[PDB]
């Protein structure tokens, strides 16, 4: 693992220092249907004309990015995503910009959000949850080794591919940082207490978020929920967690160590780092190399009808993609 | 039950990032 990460860093740093730019243009694609929206972007299924391949095109309105104070975040998002390379990270295939918008064209992950399956099924079995959790553990090990913090782990940002494995999308809050950072960002249910309390924080927040994810996958609801974010934050900071009756003793132990307010006690953040998690009893059956090599049989594989099938995604209201004859925010996004 | 309370709550749909 230590040789692997060393080589992986060399590869990442070359691309980090000299990023890819302007590798496609809008008229090379036919836009088909919206796959998802979020606070910032719209992601559309598109067909690349010259190849016939389908992709997922994230479209960011430059003026909205500026309004929502996401300039640096969006530049981070693209710079990091074009530089990373890992089996459970979605691949950025092209990126480009026009007068009005920024575009990031990713591999289309057709199995849908984990979110939709989780809500429909209700909850995942512990082996099912563990399979996904192991992929996230390996991905964070990779990202943290590159000095990256991810900061938006949630089922809505996790896609299921044709083999039933996870693809992490949405690097909107990802940041390369060696020290502390202070930005209040993420999604309410998944925020670590130290973010809420306006403290400097570090990559330990991703391990907290993993605790929340595992809990939600196995329970079918988050460990801290309420009608409004303010009410959720009060629950998070108190830190009191109650577990479903069906949770194994091993799972409860793991979660007590991940959903730990005390940073000196939180798994992932101690002397042994990620190995405290990898060697925990809950993961005793996990073959970590087999997961990385994608040789483990997935517990669930979504139904796939054919190329361009969007059956695993909700329907969204469509909007015209507008491109002004005047360049917007040219200097701000020069490096994009 | 906690499940019933969650399903009757206002945050069972997709959650977007804070902004
Ligand atoms: N590569 C992909 N393949 C298929 N669908 C995708 C892909 N990337 C994103 N999506 C879908 O589009 C949605 C929105 O994308 P994304 O999460 O990047 O937008 P956002 O505006 O940054 O969201 P957030 O509010 O969480 O910050 C995702 O939740 C997912 O449903
Ligand atoms: Mn998202
Ligand atoms: Mn985002």
Task: Describe the protein in words.
The complex is a heterodimer of chains A (336) and B (19). Chain A is α+β, with helices and mostly antiparallel strands. Chain A folds into 2 domains: 1-18 and 113-303, Orthogonal Bundle (Transferase(Phosphotransferase), domain 1); 19-112 and 304-336, Phosphorylase Kinase, domain 1 (2-Layer Sandwich), CATH 3.30.200. Chain A is 32% helix and 14% strand. In chain A, the strands form 3 sheets. In chain A, strands 1-2-3-5-4 form a 5-stranded antiparallel β-sheet. A two-stranded antiparallel sheet of chain A has the order 6-9. In chain A, helix 7 (204-219) packs antiparallel against helix 9 (249-258). The longest helix of chain A has 20 residues, at 126-145. Chain A starts with a helix and ends in a 44-residue tail after the last helix. Chain B is mainly alpha-helical. The chains are: A alpha+beta (336), B mainly alpha (19). The interface between A and B is medium-sized, with 33 and 13 residues. The site of one manganese (II) ion (MN) has 4 residues of chain A, from loops.
Descriptive keywords:
A: 336 residues, alpha+beta, Transferase(Phosphotransferase), domain 1, Phosphorylase Kinase, domain 1, 2 domains, two-stranded antiparallel sheet, 32% helix, B: 19 residues, mainly alpha, elongated, binds adenosine-5'-triphosphate, binds manganese (II) ion
């Amino acid at each position: 693992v230590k040789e692997f990460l060393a080589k992986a860093k060399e590869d990442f740093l070359k691309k980090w220092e000299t990023p890819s730019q302007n590798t496609a243009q809008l008229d090379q694609f036919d836009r088909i249907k919206t796959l998802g929206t979020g606070s910032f972007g719209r992601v559309m299924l598109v067909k690349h004309k010259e190849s016939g391949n389908h992709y997922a095109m994230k479209i960011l309105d430059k003026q909205k990015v500026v309004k929502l104070k996401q300039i640096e975040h969006t530049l981070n998002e693209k710079r990091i995503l074009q530089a990373v390379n890992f089996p459970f990270l979605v691949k950025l295939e092209f990126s480009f910009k026009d007068n009005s918008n920024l575009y990031m064209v990713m591999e289309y992950v057709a199995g849908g959000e984990m979110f939709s399956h989780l809500r429909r099924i209700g909850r995942f079995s512990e082996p099912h949850a563990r399979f996904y959790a192991a992929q996230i553990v390996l991905t964070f090990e990779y990202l943290h080794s590159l000095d990256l913090i991810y900061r938006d782990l949630k089922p809505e940002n996790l896609l299921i591919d044709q083999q039933g494995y996870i693809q992490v999308t949405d690097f909107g809050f990802a940041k390369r940082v060696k020290g502390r950072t202070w930005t209040l960002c993420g999604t309410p249910e998944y925020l670590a207490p130290e973010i809420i309390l306006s403290k400097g924080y570090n990559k330990a927040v991703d391990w907290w978020a993993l605790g929340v994810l595992i809990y939600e996958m196995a329970a079918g609801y988050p460990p801290f929920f309420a009608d409004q974010p303010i009410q959720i934050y009060e629950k998070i900071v108190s830190g009191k967690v109650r577990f479903p009756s069906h949770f194994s003793s091993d799972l409860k132990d793991l979660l007590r160590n991940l959903l730990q307010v005390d940073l000196t006690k939180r798994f992932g953040n101690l002397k042994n780092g990620v190995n405290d998690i990898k060697n925990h009893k809950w993961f005793a059956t996990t073959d970590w190399i087999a997961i990385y090599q994608r040789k483990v049989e997935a517990p669930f594989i979504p139904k796939f009808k054919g190329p361009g099938d969007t059956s695993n995604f909700d329907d969204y209201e469509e909007e015209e993609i507008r491109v002004s004859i005047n360049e917007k925010c040219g200097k701000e996004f020069t490096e994009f | 039950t906690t499940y019933a309370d969650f399903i009757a709550s206002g945050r069972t749909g997709r959650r977007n990032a804070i902004h």
